[PDB]
Amino acid sequence: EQFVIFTPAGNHFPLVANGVPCPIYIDSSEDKGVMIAAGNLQQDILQVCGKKPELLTSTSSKRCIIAGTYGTPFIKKLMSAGKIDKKELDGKNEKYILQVIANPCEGIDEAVVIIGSDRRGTIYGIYELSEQMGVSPWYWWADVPVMKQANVYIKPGQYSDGEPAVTYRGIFLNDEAPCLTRWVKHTYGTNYGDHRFYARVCELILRLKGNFLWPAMWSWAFYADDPQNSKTASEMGVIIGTSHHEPMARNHQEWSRKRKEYGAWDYTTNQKVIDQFFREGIERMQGTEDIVTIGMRGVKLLENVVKNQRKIIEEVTKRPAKETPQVWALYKEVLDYYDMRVPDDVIMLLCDDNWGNVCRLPNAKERKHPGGWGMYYHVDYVGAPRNSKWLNVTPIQNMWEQLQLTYDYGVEKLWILNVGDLKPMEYPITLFMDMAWNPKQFNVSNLLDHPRRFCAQQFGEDQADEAMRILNLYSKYNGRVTGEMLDRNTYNLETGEWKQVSDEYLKLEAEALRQYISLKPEYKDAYKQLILFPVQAMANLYEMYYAQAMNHKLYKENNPQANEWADKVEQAFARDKALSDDYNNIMSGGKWKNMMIQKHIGYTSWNDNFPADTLPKIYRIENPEKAVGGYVFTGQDGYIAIEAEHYYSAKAAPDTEWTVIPYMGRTLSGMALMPYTQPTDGASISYKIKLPKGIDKVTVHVIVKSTLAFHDRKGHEYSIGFEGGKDQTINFNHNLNELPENVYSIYYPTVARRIVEKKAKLNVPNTSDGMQTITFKPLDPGIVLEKLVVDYGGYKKSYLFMNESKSKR
Amino acid sequence: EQFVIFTPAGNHFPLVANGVPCPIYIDSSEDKGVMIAAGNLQQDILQVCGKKPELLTSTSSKRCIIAGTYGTPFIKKLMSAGKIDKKELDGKNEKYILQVIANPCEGIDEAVVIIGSDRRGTIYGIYELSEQMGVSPWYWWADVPVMKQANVYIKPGQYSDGEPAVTYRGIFLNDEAPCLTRWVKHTYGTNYGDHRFYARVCELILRLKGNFLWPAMWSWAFYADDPQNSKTASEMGVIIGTSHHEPMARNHQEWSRKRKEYGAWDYTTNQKVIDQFFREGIERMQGTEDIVTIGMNVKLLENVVKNQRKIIEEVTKRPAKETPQVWALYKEVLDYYDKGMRVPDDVIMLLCDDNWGNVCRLPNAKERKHPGGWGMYYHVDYVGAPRNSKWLNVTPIQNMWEQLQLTYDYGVEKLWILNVGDLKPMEYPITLFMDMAWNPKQFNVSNLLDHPRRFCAQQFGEDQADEAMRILNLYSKYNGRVTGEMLDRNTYNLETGEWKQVSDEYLKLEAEALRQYISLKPEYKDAYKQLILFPVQAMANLYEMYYAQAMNHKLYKENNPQANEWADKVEQAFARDKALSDDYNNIMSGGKWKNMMIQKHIGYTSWNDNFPADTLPKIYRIENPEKAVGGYVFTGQDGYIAIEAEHYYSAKAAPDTEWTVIPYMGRTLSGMALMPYTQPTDGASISYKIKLPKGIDKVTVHVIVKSTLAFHDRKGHEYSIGFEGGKDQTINFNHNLNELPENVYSIYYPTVARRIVEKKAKLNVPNTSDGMQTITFKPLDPGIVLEKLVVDYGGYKKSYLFMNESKSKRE
């Protein structure tokens, strides 16, 4: 695989040495596609080493790069210069051989030689070299830097990716408004995708070793909007197709724009016009490799359409229909129809369910279909049950798992990926393309090596593992539920599931942020696009909805903590906006402005009908300073853990106030009678609980601050007991001193941990009462009550004394 | 309070206008301390505006700053001219008045005037002006940037911090090796703390408005190592003391270093030498404001004190009461005092916290009349039982406040001295401590957090204050739970999710600190790292290390090869701990703080750091983890059994297929699928062994498979699920997952978007003699990916992740 190294070494070809690149020889007979690729190679080398290689007029230099395409005597001489068997490329599809060859031809001492079995092979060779020299396919589309190199040497040996397993390997730009469309407008000034735009797309497809494109078709018409569109793709070597409901090489919008003139999209009543519309599509794609969509939705009718479309193809081409590549999509009713006559030569394009699951795969008879089978796969969708157009939400595993299946069932003629706006599907696109190239090189053991190599490529070797880990995780997390379908109820609040997934995503963000700040500066934009932004956007969205669910829970409980969670919803909502603003406007100098504007907060339907991202509903407790006391707890799972601030009522001693010390202690806060200069006589603080009826004993754990015996050598006491029962008086610190028996056995162990936990076994006075009241009475000043746990079988020893039990006030 | 503003305004004094600072006049009569402070003021102004104010030779400039100290004739003349009453300062302690004054003296049209009741007051005035112009006390000690200003104006009015509530307000550099000691050696090129180092310390103390210092005494001797030490402190205006075990103004090391000559630290047998050692301490500190530690059976201790005070009188030719003295009551001594030990009236009785921020003893109402007053020695760093805390700040904001307010309310107001360890990273507690000692009654529970908020505003700017304060408060609280040294895999409860909770929560805090960090203007990054980010990251990571270690041990005991991942995480976090500290030491602030963050903190088995180095916590790895598959047995708890599909007991593949784990596949752990999908599944099964309570006769089993569709056969995919000893229930999980009108919107699209298919099967539990059940999943069609099973017998709660996996072990 890896033939480029970045240090000089003997019997290694010096492609760049001491900053100086060798020149490039392309024979002038080569297709313009090869030339375009060679030109990009030149530029890539310039990016790599700082000097532009010369494009040689003739076979004259000691060391150079030679690229060309099988079928030429120049290339024959070169293949027997040396020792490359014709059978390595003869009749092969989209294959290159890359090899350092000594004395390749008279006037050249040594060359790295790239020979394609056809022009795309040659292109793929060229781009393989470009890629291995450190120009990612994503150098432009995700601002992946080209690491500068003084030296670039090529290993001896013969290098090939072989032939692609899947014949046509493509993306479909779709769901393209508003992001791609406004981005294109912003970047190119055009209210359509013009050839400058499609030149970038096509360069990307080819660098990814794809060869196929369904252009954007919502409001654009690839063939019609810019007469250079087709020529650009075609000369670069990208095969163009149309989506499954765009027959006969016409873009949907060519009809829609002239609907009043064309009239009805109905074959039974408007056939002459539709046939002619069709005919013109075929005429226009003659001379190209484009694949012709057949069929039509306005069974004997559909066959007649297809019969007629194929006649039209024959009339236009003066060739049998079989010689024009065709695809018939088995998209909906049509699949039912098929379960109908389809000619042998036609690619039967099967569809996923729009969510990455294949619906139908051919059986063993079906697989004998000479035209082959296709798969149209989604990583972006607008439709039921809800649009997924925001972030990548395709788990790496799921794409792999269904594509391996797809290939194993003999679907190998055509793979086409709905990529939405292209960004931010950069990774799945790459996986898709690599899998279409060679699905059998992938198995469960090595799957993650793919995102690993991708991350090595995008962010460097030293970042690959950790970036891959995060890429894999965010893809998984996002697979769970799309941002659009995520809301306050997706996850279970009461079980801790929501907190778990929210905390987990934030942990992933922390990690992504560590990685981000560790990057060399030139990787930051790519990492932001490919890793950090999706992670932060989703982690924050999670927290928003998590905080919302908490807000609602606590609001129903009349607990003024609801207000904090409301703040968090507002903050996260604002953060969502700041994150996208940064992606659009700041990142990459605003190169991707409008690529990240998809509405995602406010869906009440499958479609994003609603105007804009909108604040999830939250509630606030008015006068939260007064919303204190009145807490009643319901025991669950055998215990009641009570944060001391959640008292039912309290009564202060004279010249004192029960005071909440927020954050005090290990958990929520502390309650203390203040000031400490006053006796506490008659103060108490009471907690109301609901035990299951019948529980007759509890062990109450009382957690106070590790206050020491500062006022009175006897130490501090409080009493704890049920209303209606006997109060136990506990002296919680009389042993917290330096006396030999105490100093190591209890004193130092205790004080370093800042709390004192005392247990009181209490008899429940009447086990028939609905509520019990536990009352804490500080008998000495300076006692800070932090927590109580009423254990009736379920308490598990916990440093935080367990999650607070259910309550409401 | 705030008298500096940063725009021009009428009736406001232009201290800096147009980038140009007005000059400074200090009368020649002023103490050198004031001069030193005025010199720093000059520098500070230079930092702020870019131009160094002139130190005027004489009272000749239209506008200038004038600072001086009550009692000089120059200041006398100045106050009896518009319009400052003598009573505002006469006899006041460490007070300033700062006031714009018109025609303050012959030759000056207008001045901002700072008048201290004494030289420290003046100094504090000066530094108040520095601070309000934007020079934090932490400008050097935590690299807090000085926001440049073209214009700095002073509000009219009279400004004062009053008198400090607590007379002596100090820090104790302690536990100082290896960090402070090596940092000093590295920075000052000395093997001891010299006067240049102590000048920085003293500058910090004075800018914080403290006045007191117990210098580092482990391997250094402040008085002896550099003869300029004492002079420097003394002339700056910092009072020097020694720690409670260093009587009579001798540093402990002065004894230790001459222990052969000396020799026994025993008053009963080596009194002549010890008395002389003492006498020399008192001779040496004459001329200074230093406070003399006294003390050293009860009759013996009284005799020592009697003799120390005779020595003080002999040396000073004055009554002992005129020499400030402090006698620490900890341990036996406190009992002696209770038991009835006579302490002379003039002595400051220094009470001690428990080394962990809790006061041990406060004076009662009678005791509080002690004329010498009372002291509190408070710790935010400690080397001792039960275990050293000398790594990070671990003092919750609330705790320092809560005990210090108590301390003050009980009339302990002569002397507050804070053990600060290496000083860094206790920057915040030190500030809180100093501000509280200044004025404890300024603080209450309702405004407490405004203190760290102002601190964060000051250090990181206004726009960062709230969020930095929030993190500061939280990390301080989190650290208060348990010290890094005392934290280990057993601190938190693993089984309840507590460990995960606190680990995840700290990492969330780090995420937040990181957001904040990367939002900062670049000049704040070093200070924020020192003050917020590093402690947060260091602790969050430490938490994860120990959390991962606990998980490792749990899973290892279960013979579950997942243990290995957790082991990786322990190694990684261990390595991260090192990277974090390396950055603090070497990269942050250009390596200014090299060696300040080298404390050992991973490896404690006992109270002291007497182990060679931070060391990898013990982890265990399952050898041959690819073979450590199957053999899982689950124990139901809480009314359900949630089973990740990979955790099967046994499996049998169909011919030419292999049960294959697809890691990460699905919503939780992974997926199990018979591969490849080109083969019929005839006879394949995968079985899970569970322990139900024997009373259970029916369960609803939720079977979670990937939303695979009917790709091979229009009938769709089936599997069977059932108990060994019971009937296998066949479920067709996707026959309805198609575009047929009945299905397309009701079930098809709602299902596939969520990537899974959950089917419930009510199963009867067959009666087994073992109490064990085996539940068996049989894919009858290719391409089925089993992800999870939940066996619900009353406890299942509908959950998107189908609830935390139940307890299991294998083999």
Ligand SMILES: O=C[C@H](O)[C@@H](O)[C@H](O)[C@H](O)C(=O)O
């Ligand atoms: O914790 C402090 C160090 O262990 C000692 O040098 C110190 O002298 C004593 O333990 C103290 O804390 O005052």
